[PDB]
Amino acid sequence: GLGTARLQLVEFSAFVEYQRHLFVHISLESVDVRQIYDKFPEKKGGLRELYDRGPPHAFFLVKFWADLNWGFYGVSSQYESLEHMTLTCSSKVCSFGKQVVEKVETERAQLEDGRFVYRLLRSPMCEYLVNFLHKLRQLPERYMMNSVLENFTILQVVTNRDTQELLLCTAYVFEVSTSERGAQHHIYRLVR
Ligand SMILES: COc1c(C)cc(N2C[C@@H](O)[C@@H](O)C2=O)cc1/C=C/c1ccc(Cl)cc1
């Protein structure tokens, strides 16, 4: 599972509008973090520096095989925790390791069924990704899509807003699936 004892990601989907097409969706083996340093900014606030501060158990890699065979572009996600917190979520989109978008959002805890849930429902997909998907979709071969996506990564850092503690850091890498197989993901622990 993707989480610590303090915070867990229970669901994530990126979609375009049953009547929904999921590009990627989440409803453990380990990888050496130094093998993916280059995929993210190596200067201040990079993966190496984040991993240096720790804690090591908060670091995950997700590989997505996206369904690009298909409106409103949206994202939904749910985190959970047993302690009431305010979350700061920083997403960085990187192209050839260079940061091209950073988005910072705040999410407040909602008490629900004995636990705290941090829910985004039908949130607008960020403009950079919408425009990228519009172009990626036109490609005639899956292998060409994979060539374009091998340089595309996303780093997501979730911190406790009030303490500045890192709660969860996830690196995302992308390939394309077939429409027959549909979307898939695998989650890995980042170790050093
Ligand atoms: C998993 O990485 C993401 C993370 C961490 C976050 C947001 N989010 C959250 C909000 O900021 C919203 O604006 C947004 O786009 C989107 C993605 C990815 C979107 C996507 C869609 C299709 C394909 Cl093939 C690949 C990726």
Side-chain angles (χ1 to χ4, degrees), residues 67-97 99-112 114:
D67 181 353
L68 259 56
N69 312 264
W70 87 102
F72 175 84
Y73 289 78
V75 174
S76 296
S77 59
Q78 176 171 317
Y79 299 87
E80 294 180 359
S81 70
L82 289 175
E83 286 200 86
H84 179 287
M85 301 175 292
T86 303
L87 304 188
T88 296
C89 305
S90 158
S91 305
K92 294 173 166 154
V93 181
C94 303
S95 177
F96 303 86
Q99 181 184 308
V100 294
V101 188
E102 188 198 349
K103 180 172 178 190
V104 177
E105 304 172 61
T106 302
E107 322 202 19
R108 281 143 187 95
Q110 167 68 39
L111 173 58
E112 181 170 283

Tab-separated table of all heavy atoms in Angstrom, residues 67-114, unseen atoms left out:
chain	number	residue	atom	x	y	z
A	67	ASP	N	-4.254	4.412	-19.951
A	67	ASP	CA	-5.185	4.124	-21.033
A	67	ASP	C	-5.446	5.428	-21.777
A	67	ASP	O	-6.155	6.308	-21.278
A	67	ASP	CB	-6.464	3.509	-20.467
A	67	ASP	CG	-7.484	3.157	-21.540
A	67	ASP	OD1	-7.276	3.501	-22.718
A	67	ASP	OD2	-8.508	2.530	-21.197
A	68	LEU	N	-4.852	5.560	-22.959
A	68	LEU	CA	-4.953	6.758	-23.779
A	68	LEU	C	-5.867	6.549	-24.978
A	68	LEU	O	-5.779	7.290	-25.961
A	68	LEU	CB	-3.567	7.191	-24.249
A	68	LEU	CG	-2.881	8.338	-23.531
A	68	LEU	CD1	-2.763	8.067	-22.054
A	68	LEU	CD2	-1.527	8.502	-24.143
A	69	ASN	N	-6.732	5.544	-24.915
A	69	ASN	CA	-7.612	5.179	-26.017
A	69	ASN	C	-9.006	5.691	-25.670
A	69	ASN	O	-9.782	5.022	-24.991
A	69	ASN	CB	-7.595	3.668	-26.243
A	69	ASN	CG	-6.181	3.095	-26.282
A	69	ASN	OD1	-5.604	2.904	-27.354
A	69	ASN	ND2	-5.618	2.819	-25.107
A	70	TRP	N	-9.314	6.898	-26.132
A	70	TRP	CA	-10.643	7.474	-25.937
A	70	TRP	C	-10.974	8.461	-27.058
A	70	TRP	O	-12.066	8.430	-27.631
A	70	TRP	CB	-10.740	8.166	-24.573
A	70	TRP	CG	-10.278	9.595	-24.574
A	70	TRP	CD1	-11.067	10.709	-24.595
A	70	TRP	CD2	-8.922	10.066	-24.553
A	70	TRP	NE1	-10.289	11.844	-24.585
A	70	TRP	CE2	-8.970	11.478	-24.560
A	70	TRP	CE3	-7.674	9.433	-24.533
A	70	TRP	CZ2	-7.819	12.265	-24.546
A	70	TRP	CZ3	-6.530	10.219	-24.518
A	70	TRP	CH2	-6.611	11.620	-24.523
A	71	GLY	N	-14.151	17.326	-23.648
A	71	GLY	CA	-14.806	16.940	-22.410
A	71	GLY	C	-14.157	17.552	-21.183
A	71	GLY	O	-13.262	18.385	-21.314
A	72	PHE	N	-14.601	17.149	-19.992
A	72	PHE	CA	-14.057	17.689	-18.751
A	72	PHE	C	-12.930	16.798	-18.239
A	72	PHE	O	-13.154	15.627	-17.912
A	72	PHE	CB	-15.134	17.834	-17.679
A	72	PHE	CG	-14.588	18.266	-16.345
A	72	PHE	CD1	-14.370	19.608	-16.072
A	72	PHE	CD2	-14.266	17.330	-15.377
A	72	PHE	CE1	-13.854	20.009	-14.850
A	72	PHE	CE2	-13.742	17.721	-14.151
A	72	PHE	CZ	-13.535	19.062	-13.888
A	73	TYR	N	-11.732	17.370	-18.136
A	73	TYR	CA	-10.557	16.673	-17.627
A	73	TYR	C	-10.441	16.911	-16.129
A	73	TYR	O	-10.294	18.055	-15.690
A	73	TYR	CB	-9.302	17.156	-18.345
A	73	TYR	CG	-9.214	16.696	-19.777
A	73	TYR	CD1	-9.946	17.320	-20.774
A	73	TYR	CD2	-8.389	15.639	-20.130
A	73	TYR	CE1	-9.864	16.898	-22.087
A	73	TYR	CE2	-8.298	15.211	-21.439
A	73	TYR	CZ	-9.039	15.843	-22.412
A	73	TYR	OH	-8.951	15.418	-23.713
A	74	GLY	N	-10.494	15.833	-15.346
A	74	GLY	CA	-10.582	15.968	-13.913
A	74	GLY	C	-9.693	14.959	-13.202
A	74	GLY	O	-9.215	13.998	-13.797
A	75	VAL	N	-9.477	15.232	-11.925
A	75	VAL	CA	-8.717	14.357	-11.037
A	75	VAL	C	-9.506	14.204	-9.748
A	75	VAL	O	-10.106	15.173	-9.260
A	75	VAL	CB	-7.302	14.922	-10.764
A	75	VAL	CG1	-6.571	14.092	-9.721
A	75	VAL	CG2	-6.490	14.986	-12.049
A	76	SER	N	-9.529	12.991	-9.198
A	76	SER	CA	-10.098	12.732	-7.886
A	76	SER	C	-9.084	11.961	-7.057
A	76	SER	O	-8.320	11.151	-7.589
A	76	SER	CB	-11.411	11.954	-7.980
A	76	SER	OG	-12.399	12.721	-8.650
A	77	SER	N	-9.070	12.229	-5.755
A	77	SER	CA	-8.119	11.579	-4.869
A	77	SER	C	-8.662	11.587	-3.451
A	77	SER	O	-9.432	12.474	-3.066
A	77	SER	CB	-6.750	12.265	-4.900
A	77	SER	OG	-6.858	13.624	-4.514
A	78	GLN	N	-8.248	10.592	-2.674
A	78	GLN	CA	-8.623	10.520	-1.268
A	78	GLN	C	-7.434	10.039	-0.460
A	78	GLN	O	-6.862	8.982	-0.749
A	78	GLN	CB	-9.824	9.594	-1.051
A	78	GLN	CG	-10.208	9.408	0.410
A	78	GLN	CD	-11.524	8.662	0.567
A	78	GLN	OE1	-12.490	8.924	-0.153
A	78	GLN	NE2	-11.564	7.725	1.509
A	79	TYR	N	-7.067	10.824	0.544
A	79	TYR	CA	-6.123	10.426	1.569
A	79	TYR	C	-6.871	10.177	2.867
A	79	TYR	O	-7.984	10.671	3.072
A	79	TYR	CB	-5.061	11.500	1.798
A	79	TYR	CG	-4.219	11.815	0.594
A	79	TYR	CD1	-4.629	12.763	-0.333
A	79	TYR	CD2	-3.004	11.172	0.388
A	79	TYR	CE1	-3.849	13.062	-1.441
A	79	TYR	CE2	-2.218	11.466	-0.719
A	79	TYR	CZ	-2.647	12.407	-1.628
A	79	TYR	OH	-1.869	12.701	-2.724
A	80	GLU	N	-6.240	9.415	3.756
A	80	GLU	CA	-6.809	9.151	5.066
A	80	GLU	C	-5.728	9.246	6.124
A	80	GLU	O	-4.543	9.045	5.852
A	80	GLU	CB	-7.473	7.777	5.143
A	80	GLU	CG	-8.685	7.637	4.263
A	80	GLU	CD	-9.304	6.270	4.386
A	80	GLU	OE1	-8.758	5.449	5.158
A	80	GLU	OE2	-10.340	6.025	3.725
A	81	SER	N	-6.161	9.553	7.340
A	81	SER	CA	-5.270	9.647	8.481
A	81	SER	C	-6.101	9.497	9.742
A	81	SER	O	-7.320	9.703	9.741
A	81	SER	CB	-4.499	10.971	8.488
A	81	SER	OG	-5.363	12.058	8.786
A	82	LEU	N	-5.428	9.106	10.817
A	82	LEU	CA	-6.066	9.001	12.114
A	82	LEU	C	-5.895	10.257	12.947
A	82	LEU	O	-6.564	10.392	13.975
A	82	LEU	CB	-5.519	7.796	12.879
A	82	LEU	CG	-5.944	6.431	12.341
A	82	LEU	CD1	-5.236	5.342	13.127
A	82	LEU	CD2	-7.465	6.258	12.429
A	83	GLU	N	-5.029	11.178	12.527
A	83	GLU	CA	-4.883	12.458	13.204
A	83	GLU	C	-5.377	13.578	12.301
A	83	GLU	O	-5.199	13.531	11.081
A	83	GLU	CB	-3.435	12.727	13.618
A	83	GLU	CG	-2.977	11.896	14.812
A	83	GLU	CD	-1.762	12.481	15.495
A	83	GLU	OE1	-1.936	13.357	16.372
A	83	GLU	OE2	-0.634	12.073	15.147
A	84	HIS	N	-6.007	14.573	12.916
A	84	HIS	CA	-6.488	15.733	12.181
A	84	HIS	C	-5.307	16.607	11.783
A	84	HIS	O	-4.573	17.099	12.645
A	84	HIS	CB	-7.479	16.516	13.035
A	84	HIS	CG	-8.011	17.744	12.370
A	84	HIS	ND1	-7.256	18.883	12.194
A	84	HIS	CD2	-9.229	18.013	11.843
A	84	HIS	CE1	-7.984	19.800	11.584
A	84	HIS	NE2	-9.185	19.297	11.359
A	85	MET	N	-5.131	16.810	10.482
A	85	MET	CA	-4.054	17.640	9.963
A	85	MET	C	-4.601	18.534	8.860
A	85	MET	O	-5.699	18.318	8.340
A	85	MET	CB	-2.887	16.797	9.411
A	85	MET	CG	-2.244	15.865	10.426
A	85	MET	SD	-0.968	14.781	9.732
A	85	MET	CE	-1.949	13.701	8.694
A	86	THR	N	-3.819	19.549	8.515
A	86	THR	CA	-3.964	20.274	7.263
A	86	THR	C	-2.782	19.891	6.379
A	86	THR	O	-1.633	19.899	6.839
A	86	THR	CB	-4.009	21.788	7.495
A	86	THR	OG1	-5.076	22.101	8.399
A	86	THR	CG2	-4.240	22.523	6.184
A	87	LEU	N	-3.065	19.532	5.127
A	87	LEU	CA	-2.052	19.036	4.211
A	87	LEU	C	-1.658	20.119	3.220
A	87	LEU	O	-2.503	20.884	2.751
A	87	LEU	CB	-2.551	17.809	3.443
A	87	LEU	CG	-3.037	16.599	4.239
A	87	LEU	CD1	-3.297	15.438	3.286
A	87	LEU	CD2	-2.043	16.208	5.316
A	88	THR	N	-0.365	20.181	2.917
A	88	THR	CA	0.159	20.925	1.782
A	88	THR	C	0.621	19.907	0.751
A	88	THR	O	1.473	19.064	1.052
A	88	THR	CB	1.311	21.841	2.192
A	88	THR	OG1	0.825	22.834	3.096
A	88	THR	CG2	1.919	22.513	0.974
A	89	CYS	N	0.048	19.961	-0.447
A	89	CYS	CA	0.369	19.027	-1.519
A	89	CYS	C	1.038	19.795	-2.651
A	89	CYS	O	0.415	20.673	-3.258
A	89	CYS	CB	-0.883	18.310	-2.025
A	89	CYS	SG	-1.845	17.447	-0.757
A	90	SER	N	2.287	19.459	-2.937
A	90	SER	CA	3.055	20.108	-3.989
A	90	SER	C	3.305	19.097	-5.093
A	90	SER	O	3.934	18.060	-4.856
A	90	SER	CB	4.379	20.647	-3.455
A	90	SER	OG	5.290	20.808	-4.521
A	91	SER	N	2.807	19.389	-6.285
A	91	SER	CA	3.007	18.544	-7.448
A	91	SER	C	3.940	19.261	-8.402
A	91	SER	O	3.730	20.441	-8.707
A	91	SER	CB	1.675	18.235	-8.131
A	91	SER	OG	0.769	17.672	-7.196
A	92	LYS	N	4.980	18.566	-8.849
A	92	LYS	CA	5.903	19.107	-9.838
A	92	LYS	C	5.868	18.202	-11.051
A	92	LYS	O	6.077	16.994	-10.920
A	92	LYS	CB	7.325	19.210	-9.279
A	92	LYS	CG	7.450	20.210	-8.149
A	92	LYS	CD	8.818	20.187	-7.504
A	92	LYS	CE	9.009	21.428	-6.631
A	92	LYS	NZ	9.978	21.213	-5.521
A	93	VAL	N	5.568	18.772	-12.214
A	93	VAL	CA	5.650	18.062	-13.481
A	93	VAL	C	7.013	18.357	-14.079
A	93	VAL	O	7.433	19.522	-14.135
A	93	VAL	CB	4.526	18.483	-14.443
A	93	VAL	CG1	4.633	17.706	-15.743
A	93	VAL	CG2	3.169	18.306	-13.793
A	94	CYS	N	7.705	17.312	-14.526
A	94	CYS	CA	9.060	17.450	-15.029
A	94	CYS	C	9.163	16.857	-16.422
A	94	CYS	O	8.583	15.807	-16.716
A	94	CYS	CB	10.083	16.778	-14.089
A	94	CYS	SG	10.043	17.411	-12.403
A	95	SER	N	9.914	17.543	-17.269
A	95	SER	CA	10.168	17.122	-18.636
A	95	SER	C	11.674	17.093	-18.807
A	95	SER	O	12.333	18.122	-18.619
A	95	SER	CB	9.513	18.080	-19.633
A	95	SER	OG	9.807	17.708	-20.960
A	96	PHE	N	12.216	15.915	-19.118
A	96	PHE	CA	13.663	15.719	-19.182
A	96	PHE	C	14.329	16.151	-17.877
A	96	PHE	O	15.374	16.805	-17.868
A	96	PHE	CB	14.250	16.458	-20.386
A	96	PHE	CG	13.632	16.045	-21.693
A	96	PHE	CD1	12.473	16.649	-22.152
A	96	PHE	CD2	14.198	15.035	-22.451
A	96	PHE	CE1	11.899	16.259	-23.352
A	96	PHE	CE2	13.632	14.645	-23.653
A	96	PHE	CZ	12.482	15.250	-24.102
A	97	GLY	N	13.699	15.793	-16.756
A	97	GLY	CA	14.185	16.153	-15.438
A	97	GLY	C	14.026	17.603	-15.044
A	97	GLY	O	14.214	17.928	-13.867
A	98	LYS	N	13.692	18.491	-15.975
A	98	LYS	CA	13.529	19.905	-15.671
A	98	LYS	C	12.092	20.173	-15.247
A	98	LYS	O	11.148	19.745	-15.921
A	98	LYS	CB	13.892	20.765	-16.882
A	99	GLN	N	11.934	20.879	-14.136
A	99	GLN	CA	10.608	21.227	-13.639
A	99	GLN	C	9.934	22.193	-14.611
A	99	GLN	O	10.493	23.239	-14.944
A	99	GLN	CB	10.735	21.841	-12.249
A	99	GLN	CG	9.431	22.236	-11.604
A	99	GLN	CD	9.637	22.933	-10.266
A	99	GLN	OE1	10.343	22.427	-9.390
A	99	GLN	NE2	9.033	24.104	-10.109
A	100	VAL	N	8.750	21.831	-15.093
A	100	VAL	CA	8.010	22.690	-16.007
A	100	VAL	C	6.706	23.189	-15.408
A	100	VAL	O	6.187	24.219	-15.874
A	100	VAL	CB	7.744	21.986	-17.355
A	100	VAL	CG1	9.052	21.752	-18.085
A	100	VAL	CG2	7.010	20.665	-17.134
A	101	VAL	N	6.156	22.511	-14.405
A	101	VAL	CA	5.015	23.011	-13.645
A	101	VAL	C	5.246	22.679	-12.185
A	101	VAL	O	5.712	21.585	-11.857
A	101	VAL	CB	3.668	22.404	-14.098
A	101	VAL	CG1	2.505	23.120	-13.395
A	101	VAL	CG2	3.514	22.461	-15.602
A	102	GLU	N	4.906	23.613	-11.306
A	102	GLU	CA	4.698	23.296	-9.900
A	102	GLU	C	3.334	23.818	-9.482
A	102	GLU	O	2.994	24.970	-9.764
A	102	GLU	CB	5.781	23.897	-8.996
A	102	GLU	CG	5.675	23.392	-7.555
A	102	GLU	CD	6.422	24.256	-6.559
A	102	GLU	OE1	7.204	25.127	-6.994
A	102	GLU	OE2	6.220	24.066	-5.339
A	103	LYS	N	2.565	22.985	-8.795
A	103	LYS	CA	1.269	23.380	-8.278
A	103	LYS	C	1.238	23.039	-6.797
A	103	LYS	O	1.648	21.940	-6.408
A	103	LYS	CB	0.146	22.674	-9.037
A	103	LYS	CG	-1.239	23.038	-8.553
A	103	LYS	CD	-2.300	22.457	-9.473
A	103	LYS	CE	-3.694	22.781	-8.952
A	103	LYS	NZ	-4.753	22.044	-9.692
A	104	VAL	N	0.791	23.983	-5.970
A	104	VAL	CA	0.719	23.788	-4.526
A	104	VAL	C	-0.724	24.001	-4.100
A	104	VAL	O	-1.303	25.061	-4.374
A	104	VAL	CB	1.662	24.734	-3.764
A	104	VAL	CG1	1.501	24.551	-2.253
A	104	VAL	CG2	3.106	24.492	-4.175
A	105	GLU	N	-1.296	23.002	-3.426
A	105	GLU	CA	-2.669	23.026	-2.937
A	105	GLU	C	-2.695	22.706	-1.451
A	105	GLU	O	-1.785	22.069	-0.918
A	105	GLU	CB	-3.558	22.013	-3.673
A	105	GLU	CG	-3.589	22.171	-5.180
A	105	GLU	CD	-4.329	21.033	-5.859
A	105	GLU	OE1	-5.534	20.846	-5.581
A	105	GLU	OE2	-3.694	20.317	-6.660
A	106	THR	N	-3.771	23.133	-0.790
A	106	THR	CA	-4.034	22.803	0.605
A	106	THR	C	-5.289	21.941	0.692
A	106	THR	O	-6.258	22.172	-0.037
A	106	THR	CB	-4.195	24.081	1.438
A	106	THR	OG1	-3.007	24.874	1.309
A	106	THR	CG2	-4.401	23.755	2.895
A	107	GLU	N	-5.268	20.934	1.569
A	107	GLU	CA	-6.416	20.058	1.789
A	107	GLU	C	-6.660	19.926	3.286
A	107	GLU	O	-5.745	19.575	4.040
A	107	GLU	CB	-6.205	18.670	1.152
A	107	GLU	CG	-5.481	18.698	-0.203
A	107	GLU	CD	-5.727	17.455	-1.057
A	107	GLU	OE1	-6.711	16.737	-0.790
A	107	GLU	OE2	-4.945	17.198	-2.005
A	108	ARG	N	-7.888	20.210	3.714
A	108	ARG	CA	-8.268	20.143	5.116
A	108	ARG	C	-8.969	18.830	5.438
A	108	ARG	O	-9.712	18.281	4.621
A	108	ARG	CB	-9.166	21.325	5.487
A	108	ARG	CG	-8.384	22.607	5.720
A	108	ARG	CD	-9.109	23.844	5.214
A	108	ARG	NE	-8.259	25.030	5.309
A	108	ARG	CZ	-7.521	25.508	4.312
A	108	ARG	NH1	-7.532	24.909	3.127
A	108	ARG	NH2	-6.773	26.589	4.497
A	109	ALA	N	-8.718	18.332	6.647
A	109	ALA	CA	-9.293	17.070	7.089
A	109	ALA	C	-10.803	17.186	7.235
A	109	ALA	O	-11.326	18.220	7.650
A	109	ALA	CB	-8.681	16.641	8.423
A	110	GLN	N	-11.498	16.112	6.876
A	110	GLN	CA	-12.930	15.964	7.096
A	110	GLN	C	-13.147	14.720	7.947
A	110	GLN	O	-12.734	13.622	7.560
A	110	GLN	CB	-13.673	15.849	5.763
A	110	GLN	CG	-15.113	15.381	5.893
A	110	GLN	CD	-15.989	16.402	6.576
A	110	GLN	OE1	-15.848	17.602	6.346
A	110	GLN	NE2	-16.894	15.935	7.432
A	111	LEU	N	-13.771	14.889	9.107
A	111	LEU	CA	-14.086	13.739	9.943
A	111	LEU	C	-15.155	12.901	9.260
A	111	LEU	O	-16.209	13.418	8.876
A	111	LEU	CB	-14.558	14.184	11.323
A	111	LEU	CG	-15.080	13.053	12.213
A	111	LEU	CD1	-14.013	11.984	12.426
A	111	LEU	CD2	-15.575	13.591	13.549
A	112	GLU	N	-14.879	11.610	9.091
A	112	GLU	CA	-15.818	10.740	8.390
A	112	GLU	C	-15.623	9.300	8.834
A	112	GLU	O	-14.551	8.725	8.613
A	112	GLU	CB	-15.638	10.863	6.888
A	112	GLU	CG	-16.602	10.012	6.096
A	112	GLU	CD	-16.566	10.335	4.622
A	112	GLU	OE1	-17.142	11.373	4.226
A	112	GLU	OE2	-15.941	9.566	3.863
A	113	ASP	N	-16.662	8.723	9.441
A	113	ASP	CA	-16.701	7.310	9.824
A	113	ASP	C	-15.487	6.918	10.667
A	113	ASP	O	-14.805	5.929	10.393
A	113	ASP	CB	-16.831	6.413	8.587
A	114	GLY	N	-15.216	7.713	11.703
A	114	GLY	CA	-14.165	7.412	12.656
A	114	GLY	C	-12.754	7.770	12.232
A	114	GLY	O	-11.816	7.518	12.998
